[PDB]
Structures are given as structure tokens and as C-alpha cells.
Amino acid sequence: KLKHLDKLLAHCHRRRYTAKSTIIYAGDRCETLFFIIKGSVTILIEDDDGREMIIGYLNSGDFFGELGLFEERSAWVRAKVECEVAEISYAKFRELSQQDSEILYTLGSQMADRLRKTTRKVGDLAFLDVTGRVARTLLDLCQQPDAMTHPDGMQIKITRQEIGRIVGCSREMVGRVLKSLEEQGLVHVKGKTMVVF
Amino acid sequence: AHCHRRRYTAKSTIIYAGDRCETLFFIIKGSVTILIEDDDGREMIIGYLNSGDFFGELGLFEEERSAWVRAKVECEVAEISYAKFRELSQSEILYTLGSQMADRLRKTTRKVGDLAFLDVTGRVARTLLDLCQQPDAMTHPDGMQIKITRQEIGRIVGCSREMVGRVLKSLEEQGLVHVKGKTMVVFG
């Protein structure tokens, strides 16, 4: 946020991506920074045999495509909802870093917060089994944007095949963790919407 | 400069998770290990930092220390106050620190995918194949020889010394390894 956006996105190159649309492909070598005005994206990487895997989500006020500003695209960035995003060239960012140093702290603050979540992501895969990881992943998507409050808990918009690429198992084997958790009295599975108690 | 200079011996902890001392560190010479604990006190190694690397910098933009930092060898490290670094911001030093942070996501995010979809047996499977990177690996006529303990492997794969020990039992009769005392030979 802050007042750095007015100086940064002064030369708007606003783009609108529909849901499911890919914005960044891994391996590309184009020097472009993105800022999310409204919407949410999905960050995807590959495992060891070339399957895609969800790492996290970025929301409004988030930058992405910024790891090349310092000395190839490291991940896929896909729009999960309708995203309003603006481009800034790496060249424009380099000049405005000299007109103000708070844009590198704004960018560094998001880079540091992504390290924390991703480092927590490494440990949650080592010290948790699949049942516990679908339990945490549900627990993490509440303290995450786009969940309204429910009388008995929270509502989240996620499919089981999305959870399988977050926790590292198949959607069918995840069918239980949602099934077994639903009959214990923690969760609701319905179409595109889950209720966590 | 000066002042800053402190020397940590091998195995010595430099940063504890949960601490709030708002201080930046720079490695003059040596290398550290970044470790996290599970919620009942089991270790896992996240990575290593070497000469020219900063650490203790994630609060520099805001909090609780995010990981344990342990000295792998005798390390010489320098303080930087968050104020001194912020005052010295004035200007290429913010690009230098961000370049180290950008490489830390890539390596750590790449580590997530290699750890996901793997069970404890599978992490010991490559970690033994990964054990070529350790500076204590000898050549074997039929493969590689390394001197490593179960509690050292337990901090790489994130599981107990007993579970790493049985998994190696199953692997020795399957055909990767032969265990002799404190040294195992991995075939192929």
C-alpha cells in the first residue's frame, strides 16, 4: 500500500485477466513487475517429475514477478479469480528506487513474508502426515482472504484436487481427509465451497 | 566497521527462534545452518549460509525470529543494528540484500516441491544420493563412502534417529547401502 504506489504505477499499464488465465510461465526471461489491484493469483511449481504444485496465493496489494529485479521466471503465476493487475517495467522500477528507497522495503517486506510462509511450508511437510496437512491447509485458508464467516465456522472456496496439489497427495486419497474430517465434526464438503468448524 | 565482530565456535547457536533483538548479522567468514524445530523439539535443516551472506533480516521491515541459526564451523559475524542499516540505506546495499533474499525463496521453494509427495523412506532415498554434496564423502570402488550418523540424517529429512535407523535397515537389504559403524557406503 502506502504512497509509493502513486509514484510507482503513475504510468499505468493495467491488465485484466479472467479466472484460470496464466500470467507468468516458469522459465520465461521477461523483465516485468506486476501489482495486484483486485483479485488473487495462484503460484505453482513443479515436483521432481514435472507435475504442477500449488505453493501459495497472492492477493490485493501484492507484487509478483519481482525476483528478477535482483542479480528466469521461478514459478507459474495463474489468476484464480478475475485479477486487475498493472505492469511496471524492471527499468521503471530501477529508476524509482533511486527517487525513493521505501519501494525496496515495500518489495522486501513482501519477499520476507513469503520466505516465512514458505519456510513454514517446508516444516509442515516434514513433521505432518497427509491427514495433518489437509488439516493445517484448511486451517490456513481461514486466515487468508476470500473466506466469509459462517455461524458454525468459516467458508472457503477450494476443491479437493486443489488441496491435493497443496499437501502432496492425490485428490482421491484426499477424499478421506475431507471425508474422515467431515464425519468427525470439523468440516463440510460441498461444491466449490468448504465449511470448516 | 569493527565493534560488530563476534566469533562463534562450531555447533554454537547464534539466533533462537522467538527472540526479538532486532539486529542484522553479516558473515565475514564461516558458514551457518538454518534449522527449524518441530513443535516438540525435533530439528530439520532448511539450508546453509556462507561468507558474504546476511541473516537475521526478516524483521528489518516490520517480530519473532523465524528460524534457528547455528554455527556449522567457527564463524566470524558482525552486528548491524536495524537503525544503522536503515540509516546507511541513504544505495546498492538494498539490492545486495534483496538478491540474497530472492535466492533464498528460489532454493527454499524448490525444496518444498522436492519434499512434497515424499514419505520418510523416500527422503532418505535421495538424501543418501544427495550425500555427495557433504565435504566428508570418500570415493568407494562401487559407489560412495561417507561418515554420517543417524541424528545427522534426522536433521536433513525431518524424522527421528530410530526411524532413520530402521529405514536404513530396509535399504541395506534392498541394495543401496552397507552400514559399517559410523560410515555407510552407497552403491551405484
Ligand SMILES: Nc1ncnc2c1ncn2[C@@H]1O[C@@H]2COP(=O)(O)O[C@H]2[C@H]1O
Ligand atoms: N514461494 C513463493 N511464495 C510466493 N510467491 C512466489 C514464490 N515463489 C515464486 N513466487 C512468485 O512467482 C514469481 C515467478 O516469477 P519471478 O521469479 O519473477 O517472481 C516470482 C514471485 O513473484
Ligand SMILES: Nc1ncnc2c1ncn2[C@@H]1O[C@@H]2COP(=O)(O)O[C@H]2[C@H]1O
Ligand atoms: N528458509 C530460509 N532460508 C534461508 N534463510 C532463512 C530461512 N528462514 C529463515 N532464514 C534466516 O534465519 C533468520 C532467523 O531470524 P530472522 O527471522 O530475523 O531472519 C531469518 C533469516 O535471515
Ligand SMILES: [Au+]
Ligand atoms: Au494504476
Ligand SMILES: [Au+]
Ligand atoms: Au500420498
Ligand SMILES: [Au+]
Ligand atoms: Au560491539
Ligand SMILES: [Au+]
Ligand atoms: Au540479538
Ligand SMILES: [Au+]
Ligand atoms: Au518422523
Ligand SMILES: [Cl-]
Ligand atoms: Cl478466524
Ligand SMILES: [Cl-]
Ligand atoms: Cl504419498
